[PDB]
Design an enzyme around this catalytic site. Structure first.
Site, PDB file in Angstrom:
ATOM      1  N   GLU A 135       0.836  -1.192   0.000  1.00 41.14           N
ATOM      2  CA  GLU A 135       0.000   0.000   0.000  1.00 41.14           C
ATOM      3  C   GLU A 135       0.873   1.243   0.000  1.00 41.14           C
ATOM      4  O   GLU A 135       0.648   2.179  -0.778  1.00 41.14           O
ATOM      5  CB  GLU A 135      -0.916   0.017   1.223  1.00 41.14           C
ATOM      6  CG  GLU A 135      -1.691  -1.265   1.481  1.00 41.14           C
ATOM      7  CD  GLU A 135      -2.660  -1.646   0.371  1.00 41.14           C
ATOM      8  OE1 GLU A 135      -2.912  -0.836  -0.548  1.00 41.14           O
ATOM      9  OE2 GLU A 135      -3.176  -2.781   0.425  1.00 41.14           O
ATOM     10  N   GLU A 139      -4.149   4.651  -1.694  1.00 40.38           N
ATOM     11  CA  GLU A 139      -3.083   3.826  -1.132  1.00 40.38           C
ATOM     12  C   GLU A 139      -2.601   4.378   0.206  1.00 40.38           C
ATOM     13  O   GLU A 139      -2.129   3.610   1.053  1.00 40.38           O
ATOM     14  CB  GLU A 139      -1.939   3.635  -2.132  1.00 40.38           C
ATOM     15  CG  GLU A 139      -2.358   3.076  -3.510  1.00 40.38           C
ATOM     16  CD  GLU A 139      -2.997   1.680  -3.486  1.00 40.38           C
ATOM     17  OE1 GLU A 139      -3.330   1.156  -2.403  1.00 40.38           O
ATOM     18  OE2 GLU A 139      -3.176   1.103  -4.581  1.00 40.38           O
ATOM     19  N   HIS A 157      -5.163   2.857   2.471  1.00 44.32           N
ATOM     20  CA  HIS A 157      -4.907   1.447   2.728  1.00 44.32           C
ATOM     21  C   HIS A 157      -3.698   1.238   3.628  1.00 44.32           C
ATOM     22  O   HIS A 157      -3.679   0.281   4.411  1.00 44.32           O
ATOM     23  CB  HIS A 157      -4.696   0.708   1.410  1.00 44.32           C
ATOM     24  CG  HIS A 157      -5.870   0.773   0.489  1.00 44.32           C
ATOM     25  ND1 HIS A 157      -5.819   0.318  -0.810  1.00 44.32           N
ATOM     26  CD2 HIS A 157      -7.126   1.240   0.678  1.00 44.32           C
ATOM     27  CE1 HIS A 157      -6.992   0.512  -1.386  1.00 44.32           C
ATOM     28  NE2 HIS A 157      -7.807   1.055  -0.500  1.00 44.32           N
ATOM     29  N   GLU A 182      -2.196  -5.802  -8.738  1.00 44.67           N
ATOM     30  CA  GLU A 182      -3.572  -5.589  -8.296  1.00 44.67           C
ATOM     31  C   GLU A 182      -4.572  -6.461  -9.055  1.00 44.67           C
ATOM     32  O   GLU A 182      -5.373  -7.166  -8.434  1.00 44.67           O
ATOM     33  CB  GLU A 182      -3.928  -4.102  -8.389  1.00 44.67           C
ATOM     34  CG  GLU A 182      -3.210  -3.286  -7.322  1.00 44.67           C
ATOM     35  CD  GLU A 182      -3.232  -1.788  -7.550  1.00 44.67           C
ATOM     36  OE1 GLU A 182      -3.197  -1.345  -8.715  1.00 44.67           O
ATOM     37  OE2 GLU A 182      -3.264  -1.048  -6.545  1.00 44.67           O
ATOM     38  N   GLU A 197     -10.419  -1.010  -5.203  1.00 41.32           N
ATOM     39  CA  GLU A 197      -9.408  -1.615  -6.063  1.00 41.32           C
ATOM     40  C   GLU A 197      -9.766  -1.548  -7.541  1.00 41.32           C
ATOM     41  O   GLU A 197      -8.866  -1.506  -8.387  1.00 41.32           O
ATOM     42  CB  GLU A 197      -9.165  -3.076  -5.674  1.00 41.32           C
ATOM     43  CG  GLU A 197      -7.770  -3.571  -6.043  1.00 41.32           C
ATOM     44  CD  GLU A 197      -6.684  -2.863  -5.245  1.00 41.32           C
ATOM     45  OE1 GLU A 197      -6.722  -2.948  -4.001  1.00 41.32           O
ATOM     46  OE2 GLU A 197      -5.813  -2.201  -5.851  1.00 41.32           O
ATOM     47  N   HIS A 232      -8.133   1.106  -9.386  1.00 44.80           N
ATOM     48  CA  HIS A 232      -6.706   0.940  -9.630  1.00 44.80           C
ATOM     49  C   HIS A 232      -6.460  -0.014 -10.788  1.00 44.80           C
ATOM     50  O   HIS A 232      -5.557   0.210 -11.603  1.00 44.80           O
ATOM     51  CB  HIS A 232      -6.011   0.421  -8.373  1.00 44.80           C
ATOM     52  CG  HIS A 232      -6.293   1.229  -7.146  1.00 44.80           C
ATOM     53  ND1 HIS A 232      -5.793   0.898  -5.905  1.00 44.80           N
ATOM     54  CD2 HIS A 232      -7.031   2.350  -6.966  1.00 44.80           C
ATOM     55  CE1 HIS A 232      -6.210   1.780  -5.015  1.00 44.80           C
ATOM     56  NE2 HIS A 232      -6.962   2.672  -5.633  1.00 44.80           N
TER      57      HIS A 232
HETATM   58 FE   LIG Z   1      -4.252  -0.681  -1.978  1.00 49.29          FE
HETATM   59 FE   LIG Z   2      -4.470  -0.633  -5.100  1.00 46.74          FE
END
Ligand SMILES: [Fe+3]
Ligand SMILES: [Fe+3]
Ligand SMILES: [Cl-]
Ligand SMILES: [Cl-]
Ligand SMILES: [Cl-]
Ligand SMILES: [Cl-]
Lengths: 387, 168, 515
Positions: C103, C133, C136, C198, C232, C235
């Site tokens: 992260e 991030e 996270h 990811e 997610e 991303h």
């Molecule tokens: Fe993440």
């Molecule tokens: Fe991510």
């Protein structure tokens, strides 16, 4: 439906039999070894500090050895080559607002939702009816619109900072500063889009603002400075200092607070102050963190303070000159506004510049040992005030 | 045979004693260039301080950087390398070198040696980073062309490894 | 005019602002990325999600309030923090802290990608990920913070940001989820982070962790990770848009599939052995055998469907996929041997498979009992769990010719004499230094790019030192200064101390001295 160990009788009994009947250590403070800045270790520090996996050869790191994968040629994942400044510990920085992600988004969410309630009521109230039309159409729409490009450029200056900087608390400060700047640009455009819903014929396209930002002499020096801070250098401390502590603290504060916010309240504009309230709140929050990094941590580092001041003073000389030139161009905009004694006349602009440069001397120059004659800078800018 | 502790040991201490004797930008520049040629990169002259060289390099950098701010005109911190060369001229020399490289093996050594000789504080940070980026672009373009085209047996010979063991 | 105006209530929705974002960038000569790259991301690239800053904050704050309510109000009232099976509570020390570094480095990687893009919309998509991030990082931190307060063993939950540095599995995590995310061509980093890291691993892994957690009594991790998961898809879309943005650059046809294959091999080299080890050996209650999960995630979902959608931009499934699949049958069991044998270098308390676990392993991996099962049972008989024994299996490995090597590229351990997986040892001397590599793909990376891969390994740093001295120096102890954080059993009695380690006399060798 899957069985869950917390509620399934058989599994909960198995777990209960496996769990020791006493705790296996008494130290329940997460990352208890962090040196607290304040009287007690904060949640902000616990959640943020030492997340970055620096080795001992980057000042303050707790790990060891080379990185596992570097750039072609050998550039390290993070390295001392990223900035001229030096410190005994890159982890020392603390945001005085103690922002980790949750309080940051909680506060901005409050502003997001309240803003839409305010706009729905302001349109219902009809309060736009009393704004001066010339201010609204020829100054606010065009030149406040153009200012969004300054905020947007300062936002983008942070891209390499977010990649290159050397600790976790610094990275958070930098990213939150960046998002606040793009927020400012987005909020200016939001204001223009809102006015367009209330005023037939008011064009909220960015075409005219962008033409002004890119070609009008009024913004020539500002755009040149922003382009240099964003794309002309990569030292991440140089970027943060030049961007926030020099350019935005002089040109940016003048344009947002002394021009658009202040003059809104002489030309009957009951809308713009709601938007500048946010940008000015964000400026002061960012300043608190920038001040900690550059004054407490770097200019006064016990081993490298004088060294760092040498660089900070060199940067300040250069970028202050750029910002003075930007303001000298910008004050040409007063030729286009209706005269209001004490506000838009040469004497009123002089007092506004005395506030900006005088505040800047106390808030930053004095703290790094940079000598500045306030009256000299005021007079240099006023040479651009048209007769 | 037996390594000393990671973060505090006789090798790091011995080098700290050497660094403390540096008194001029010229002396510290020769010291750091010699050190980086001797002890850094796959083409280093010696692995004798492998687990300590990165920390030691940090301490040399700190010494040279303070000598710069104490001894040099401020303008030289912006426009010059501590060798006395103009920083933009260094950039021009090394970009030209890598653009003339005829193989990934010539190009990799040019980039590595640029870093050994000019890593900050030798070259100003802004000039160094943009030169390093330009060199890396060229190096990657050459290396990543037909990357899987040479078999491992051929790459081992091109690199010049001594193969000590290959599991059957 | 001053009397007449439309007074209908109106605001400004986020998409009305986002429409104008592309126009916020402007042309100037120096307006180009600062980072080395073979590619140019196209100036007109768009983004899938129309998120402005105010709306970003509104949507994430709302998720946070629900999550922190559950954790700080409901689960605390239930005492749920101490209702986790000890094996899983220990596994979460590693899972949460190791994922935390991914992260964290993904913040910096996403900022580098923001720098690489020219289109304001593409910059903005990477920026949303930058912010996520950070979120996270603090969420993984919060899991270990909560366990530190409420679980029966806070040690290692409370200090992994320093104690992880002691052990060898941390080095491999840094390759895939720290350095691999930020060190290289931004496009290579984007394939390591978004297209592989990811889309292939993190997206299903975060969910799977919650399933193993809830099965083993942990309701903390589902509360947090199920919220992480909602971010997610944005991303993964950033990774898709990276490929879209370079599709018209001739450089994409020259280079992209090479960067993608190298990144795929990089990520799987660590996660294939390590995730199966953490799930199957770090649990009591089992969800699914890792061999089945891997095939679904990597070969079917990702290598088939998800990468297939990029065929219209010239992307090919990685050439090394078939090789990765061949190693996924036994690689995590091979790694388990190393992890159990080197337990004192960790920060978690381990549990040898009990009779019921052994039956599960042999049912799902026929052949396990006759190899790993016999080894683990022998270690137990030799005193694995007993602090009076002076027995640590790394020494048994050496005494019986089962040397442990570290891949110079991936940092993943390898025991060729006991491995059922597909690695094979290559040892080279270059310029006065010996190097061990373990597969064809990483060996190529090292041969072509030696200056990218100079990571010191644990044997090089610890050579000739005694194990208890290494642990003490690295702070691998509880608050009494003497009982190890790491343990070879999960019980509350007979915990090992530094003196118990010293009794074994484990001194690190140079594994390449023989060559
Ligand atoms: Fe993440
Ligand atoms: Fe991510
Ligand atoms: Cl510490
Ligand atoms: Cl109008
Ligand atoms: Cl030598
Ligand atoms: Cl010269």
């Amino acid at each position: 439906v899957t069985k869950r160990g917390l509620t399934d009788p058989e599994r909960a009994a198995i777990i209960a039999a496996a769990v020791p009947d006493h705790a296996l250590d008494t130290q329940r403070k997460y990352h208890y070894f962090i040196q607290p800045r304040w009287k007690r270790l904060s949640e902000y520090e616990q959640l943020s500090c030492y997340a970055q996996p620096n080795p001992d050869w980057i000042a303050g790191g707790l790990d060891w050895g080379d990185w596992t994968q570097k750039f072609h040629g050998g550039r390290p994942s993070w390295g001392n080559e990223s900035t001229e400044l030096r410190t005994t510990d890159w982890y020392r920085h603390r945001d005085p607002a103690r922002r980790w992600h949750h309080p940051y988004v909680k506060d901005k969410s409050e502003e997001a939702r309240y803003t839409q309630r305010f706009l729905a009521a302001y349109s219902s109230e009809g309060s736009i009816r009393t704004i001066d039309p010339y201010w609204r159409d020829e100054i606010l729409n065009k030149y406040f619109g153009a200012l969004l490009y300054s905020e947007y450029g300062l936002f983008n200056a942070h891209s390499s900072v977010g990649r290159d900087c050397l600790s976790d608390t610094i990275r958070q400060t930098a990213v939150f500063a960046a998002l606040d700047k793009v927020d400012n640009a987005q909020m200016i455009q939001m204001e223009r889009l809102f006015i367009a819903k209330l005023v037939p014929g008011f064009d909220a396209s960015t075409d005219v603002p962008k033409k002004i930002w890119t070609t009008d002499p009024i913004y020539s020096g500002a755009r040149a400075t922003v382009q240099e801070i964003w794309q002309g250098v990569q030292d991440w401390n140089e970027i943060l200092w030049a961007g926030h502590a020099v350019y935005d603290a002089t040109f940016g504060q003048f344009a947002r607070r002394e021009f658009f916010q202040r003059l809104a309240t002489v030309y009957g504009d009951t809308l713009t102050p709601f938007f500048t309230a946010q940008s000015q709140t964000y400026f002061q929050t960012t300043r608190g963190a920038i001040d900690d990094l550059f004054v407490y941590c770097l200019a006064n580092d016990s081993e490298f303070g004088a060294h760092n001041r040498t660089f900070l003073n060199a940067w300040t000389e250069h970028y202050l000159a750029s910002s003075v030139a930007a303001l000298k161009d910008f004050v040409g905009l007063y030729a286009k506004v209706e005269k209001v004694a004490g506000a838009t006349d040469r004497a009123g602009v002089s007092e506004a510049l005395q506030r900006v440069f005088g505040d800047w001397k106390i808030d930053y120059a004095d703290k790094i040992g940079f000598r500045v004659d306030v009256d000299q800078k005021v007079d240099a800018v006023l040479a651009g005030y048209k007769n | 045979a037996k390594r000393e502790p990671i973060h505090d040991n006789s090798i790091r201490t011995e080098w700290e004693a050497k660094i403390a004797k540096l008194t001029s930008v010229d002396q510290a520049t020769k010291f750091i260039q010699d050190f980086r040629l001797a002890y850094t990169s796959p083409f280093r002259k010696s692995y004798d301080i492998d687990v300590d060289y990165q920390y030691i390099e940090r301490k040399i950098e700190e010494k040279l950087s303070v000598l710069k701010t104490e001894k040099l005109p401020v303008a030289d911190l912006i426009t010059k390398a501590t060798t006395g060369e103009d920083a933009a001229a260094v950039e021009a020399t090394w970009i030209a070198k890598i653009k003339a490289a005829k193989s990934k093996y010539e190009a990799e050594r040019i980039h590595i040696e640029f870093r050994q000789l000019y890593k900050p504080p030798v070259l100003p940070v802004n000039v160094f980073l943009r030169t390093d980026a330009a060199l890396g672009t060229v190096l990657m373009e050459i290396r990543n062309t037909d990357y899987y085209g040479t078999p491992l047996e051929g790459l081992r010979k091109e690199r010049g490894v001594k193969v000590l063991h290959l599991q059957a | 005019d001053a009397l007449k105006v439309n007074r209908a209530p109106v605001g400004v929705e986020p998409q009305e602002v986002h429409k104008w974002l592309q126009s916020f960038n402007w042309d100037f000569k120096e307006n180009r990325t600062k980072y080395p790259t073979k590619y140019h991301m196209a100036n007109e690239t768009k983004e899938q999600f129309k998120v402005i800053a105010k709306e970003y904050a509104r949507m994430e704050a709302a998720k946070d309030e629900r999550q922190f309510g559950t954790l700080l109000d409901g689960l605390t009232r239930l005492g749920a923090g101490n209702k986790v099976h000890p094996r899983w509570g220990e596994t979460m020390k590693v899972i949460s802290n190791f994922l935390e570094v991914g992260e964290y480095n993904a913040i910096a990687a996403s900022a580098m990608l923001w720098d690489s893009a020219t289109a304001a919309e593409q910059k903005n998509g990477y920026l949303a990920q930058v912010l996520d991030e950070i979120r996270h990082t603090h969420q993984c931190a919060f899991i270990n913070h909560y366990y530190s307060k409420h679980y029966h063993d806070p040690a290692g939950h409370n200090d992994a940001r320093r104690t992880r540095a002691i052990g060898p599995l941390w080095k491999g995590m840094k390759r895939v989820f720290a350095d691999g995310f930020i060190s290289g061509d931004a496009v290579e980093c984007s394939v390591n982070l978004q297209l592989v890291g990811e889309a292939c691993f993190t997206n299903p892994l975060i969910v799977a962790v919650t399933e193993w957690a809830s099965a083993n009594g942990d309701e903390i991790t589902p509360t947090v990770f199920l919220s992480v998961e909602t971010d997610e898809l944005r991303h993964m879309a950033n990774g898709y848009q990276t490929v879209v943005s370079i599709a018209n650059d001739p450089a994409s046809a020259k280079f992209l599939n090479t960067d993608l294959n190298n990144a795929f091999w990089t990520q799987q080299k660590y996660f294939t052995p390590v995730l199966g080890y953490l799930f199957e050996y770090g649990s009591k209650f089992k969800v699914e055998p890792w061999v089945k999960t891997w095939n679904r995630w990597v070969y079917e979902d990702w290598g088939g469907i998800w990468i297939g959608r990029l065929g219209k931009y010239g992307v090919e499934s990685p050439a090394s996929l078939r090789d990765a699949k061949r190693d996924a049958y036994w690689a995590h069991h091979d790694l388990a041997l190393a992890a159990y044998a080197m337990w004192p270098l960790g920060f978690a308390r381990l549990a040898l498979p009990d009779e019921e676990d052994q039956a599960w392993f042999e049912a799902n991996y026929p052949g396990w009992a006759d190899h790993y099962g016999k080894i683990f049972n022998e270690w137990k008989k030799l005193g694995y769990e007993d602090p009076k024994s002076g027995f640590i299996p790394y020494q048994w490995l050496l005494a019986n010719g089962h040397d442990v090597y570290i891949d110079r590229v991936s940092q993943v351990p390898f025991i060729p004499s006991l491995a059922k997986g597909t690695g094979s040892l290559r040892v080279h001397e270059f310029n006065g230094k010996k190097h061990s590599l373990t597969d064809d793909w990483g060996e190529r990376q090292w041969l072509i790019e030696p200056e990218r891969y100079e990571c010191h390994n644990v044997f090089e740093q610890y050579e000739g030192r005694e194990l208890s001295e290494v642990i003490a120096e690295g702070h691998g102890v509880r608050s009494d200064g003497k009982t190890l954080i790491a343990q070879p059993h999960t019980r509350g009695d007979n915990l090992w101390t530094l003196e118990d380690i010293k009794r074994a006399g484990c001194v690190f060798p140079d594994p390449l001295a023989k060559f």
